[PDB]
């Protein structure tokens, strides 16, 4: 879309309807006459547009009302209400822009933010934007969290998120204008290369790909048309459903074969019965011929009975000879029909062993998307976020994804090498307890009005706790933390001196010997100016490969690569970097997925702030003090960087609404 139209779409907003968000801040409007709603909607969309077309400058309210036009620019308050709602909730003046109005001399409120991942950094940026005093506590010696970029010399390569999934309605679109991000389109041509090293023939490539997609729809059919969602008291996973679909297609192939062979034997039987009728008739002809010859022998002149005998025995043989002619007519058609059925036999197999291996690579592909074995994905909800898809082609970052957090981080108070260990939250405020990661004897106490926790789901899942909560988080939050899944996916960065692959190929597959190792080094990316190939390890392979040395893993990489290009073409790598996100203690995983037994409802429980009980019993129920952001808290856009940016923007808005107050709901 385009216009004030397009600005709504490019802010994930319905252009013609008011959201549940806005119903809450503008209950007058949404309950008011329909004409006014249209008015509000336009001044929403136009401000949106004004921000979007130049997002390197702050969009002031009074710079806004100036570009606004009558009759819209008539209600000065509705404009001010709209602009402030947008500004609070991070739809405008978010990211990295030049402050027109400079920052307030004196601040209000104190927020401690745990983690400088993008979710924390975005919140922090916004809270400081709103006039609060913010400090981030970072366990690592760098910002970005799971946005991690390797840099040695001119070699650069993301160990963490590396793909922007489409600028159509993506907040990273805004960010890219705001920060120099060199975005490179992903060319969708990907050739598979079996374990022998020879490319899959284009014809087989296309056939198995369509079985994969056919197989996916089939599970969707088991899920939604057949309510095959719980099996023997346990929720069904996607992988389970794929087996039952593959099995039923294997069963159907046997049924076709049985039915076709059964038709042949039925036709054979018809024949066998026909042949017996013919053999008896032929033997019955036999004695009749003999009888006619004996009767014929009696030479004339003969009495009528003898003449009748000849005439009679002659009818009978002619008649039975007519009958044997009709039955070799009937054996003719049966003989040809049996040849037809023999030459028209249905497929012997549903999938060949080579065909099944290709299918794995598509499954490893999907285990890469959801950073987890398909046996863990919920069949019912693994594609619950299918609807919110961004438009445009996927892109990668040539300069490394780090440049974004590093950019967000300027002007912010980040304490690095600072590992939080307790979070204490009470009716009257909070204290966060952190240590030095270098020497853990050193100990720090941070006091504040609210804590924003962006701890990774894998960290929050750790047993025994890497971070104590005082008092303990309530059972509804811990149960969502268990139920939700935190997957794993790892990369191997391969650093050579000269390109030796198809450079117009961004990316090419390798097909696994076994199905158990389908994710093990199944895919390679070339998306950098320098000669760097990047190899994925997904599915079950990810967890296994972390117990296996760097060198042996580069070992198996080189093997793969030799088979596809020849032992003479592929040098030893200058630099090798293999990730281990599950072992990383500041992540303990790569991203989350919708586990079987979980749902998108869990992602929302994950984002509910915590409100401590009263200090003085009988005292009025207090303010919430513990807020959560990060990839696992945004239900509609999880496991991504854009969802993590949005989570931080959402919490900043929610925190400001409680500590600075909202003056836009009147």
């Amino acid at each position: 879309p385009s216009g004030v139209e397009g600005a709504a779409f490019q802010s994930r907003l319905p252009h013609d309807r008011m959201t549940s968000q806005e119903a809450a801040c503008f209950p007058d409007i949404i309950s008011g006459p329909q004409q006014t709603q249209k008015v509000f909607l336009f001044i929403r969309n136009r401000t949106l547009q004004l921000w979007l077309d130049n997002p390197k400058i702050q969009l002031t309210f009074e710079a806004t009302l100036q570009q606004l036009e009558a009759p819209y620019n008539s209600d000065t308050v509705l404009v001010h209400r709209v602009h402030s709602y947008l500004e609070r909730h991070g739809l405008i003046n978010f990211g990295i822009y030049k402050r027109i109005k400079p920052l307030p001399t004196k601040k209000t409120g104190k927020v401690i933010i745990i983690g400088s991942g993008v979710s924390g950094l975005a919140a922090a940026r916004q809270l400081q934007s709103f006039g609060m005093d913010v400090t981030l506590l970072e366990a690592r010696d760098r910002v970005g969290g799971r946005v991690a970029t390797f840099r040695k010399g001119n070699y650069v390569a993301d160990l963490g998120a590396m793909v922007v999934t489409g600028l159509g309605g993506n907040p990273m679109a805004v960010v890219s204008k705001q920060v120099n991000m060199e975005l490179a389109k992903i060319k969708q041509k990907c050739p598979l290369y079996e374990a022998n090293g020879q490319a899959v023939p284009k014809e087989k490539d296309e056939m198995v790909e369509q079985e994969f997609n056919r197989l996916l729809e089939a599970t969707s059919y088991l899920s939604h048309q057949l309510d095959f969602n719980v099996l023997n008291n346990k929720p069904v996973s996607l992988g389970q459903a794929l087996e039952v679909v593959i099995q039923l297609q294997e069963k159907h192939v046997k049924d076709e074969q049985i039915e076709h062979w059964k038709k042949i034997v039925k036709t054979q039987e018809e024949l066998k019965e026909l042949l017996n009728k013919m053999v008896n008739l032929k033997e019955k002809i036999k004695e009749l011929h003999q009888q006619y010859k004996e009767a014929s022998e009696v030479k004339p002149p003969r009495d009528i009975t003898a003449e009748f005998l000849v005439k009679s025995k002659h009818r009978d043989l002619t008649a039975l000879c007519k009958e044997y002619d009709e039955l070799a007519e009937t054996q003719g058609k049966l003989e040809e029909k049996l040849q037809e059925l023999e030459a028209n036999p249905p497929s012997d197999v549903y999938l060949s062993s080579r065909d099944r291996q290709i299918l794995d690579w598509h499954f490893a592909n999907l285990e890469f998307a959801n950073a987890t074995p398909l046996s863990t994905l919920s069949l019912k909800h693994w594609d619950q976020d299918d609807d919110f898809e961004f438009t445009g082609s996927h892109l990668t970052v040539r300069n490394g994804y780090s440049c974004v957090p590093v950019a967000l981080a300027e002007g912010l108070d980040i304490k690095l090498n600072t590992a939080v260990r307790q979070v204490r939250y009470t009716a009257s405020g909070c204290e966060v307890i952190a240590v030095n990661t270098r020497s853990t004897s050193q100990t720090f106490i941070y006091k504040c009005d609210a804590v924003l926790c962006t701890l990774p789901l894998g960290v929050l899942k750790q047993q025994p706790p890497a971070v104590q909560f005082v008092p303990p988080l309530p059972e509804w939050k811990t149960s969502a933390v268990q139920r939700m899944g935190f997957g794993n996916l790892n990369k191997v960065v391969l650093c050579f001196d000269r390109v030796f692959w198809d450079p117009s190929v961004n990316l090419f597959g390798h097909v696994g010997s076994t199905t158990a190792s389908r994710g093990e080094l199944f895919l390679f990316w070339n998306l950098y100016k320098a000669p760097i190939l990047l190899a994925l390890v997904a599915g079950e392979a990810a967890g296994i490969m972390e117990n296996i040395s760097d060198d042996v893993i580069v070992g198996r990489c080189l093997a793969i690569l030799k088979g596809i290009f020849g032992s003479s073409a592929v040098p030893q790598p200058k630099e090798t970097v293999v990730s281990r996100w599950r072992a990383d203690p500041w992540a303990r995983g790569s991203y989350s997925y919708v586990a079987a037994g979980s749902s998108g409802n869990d992602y929302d429980l994950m984002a509910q702030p915590i409100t401590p009980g009263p200090s003085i019993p009988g005292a009025p129920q207090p303010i919430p003090r513990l807020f959560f952001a990060g990839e696992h808290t945004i239900r509609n856009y999880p496991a991504t960087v854009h969802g993590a940016l949005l989570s931080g923007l959402r919490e900043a808005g929610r925190i400001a609404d409680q500590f600075l107050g909202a003056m836009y709901t009147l």
Partner: peptide, 4 residues
């Protein structure tokens, strides 16, 4: 979520 899935890719290409």
């Amino acid at each position: 979520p899935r890719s290409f």
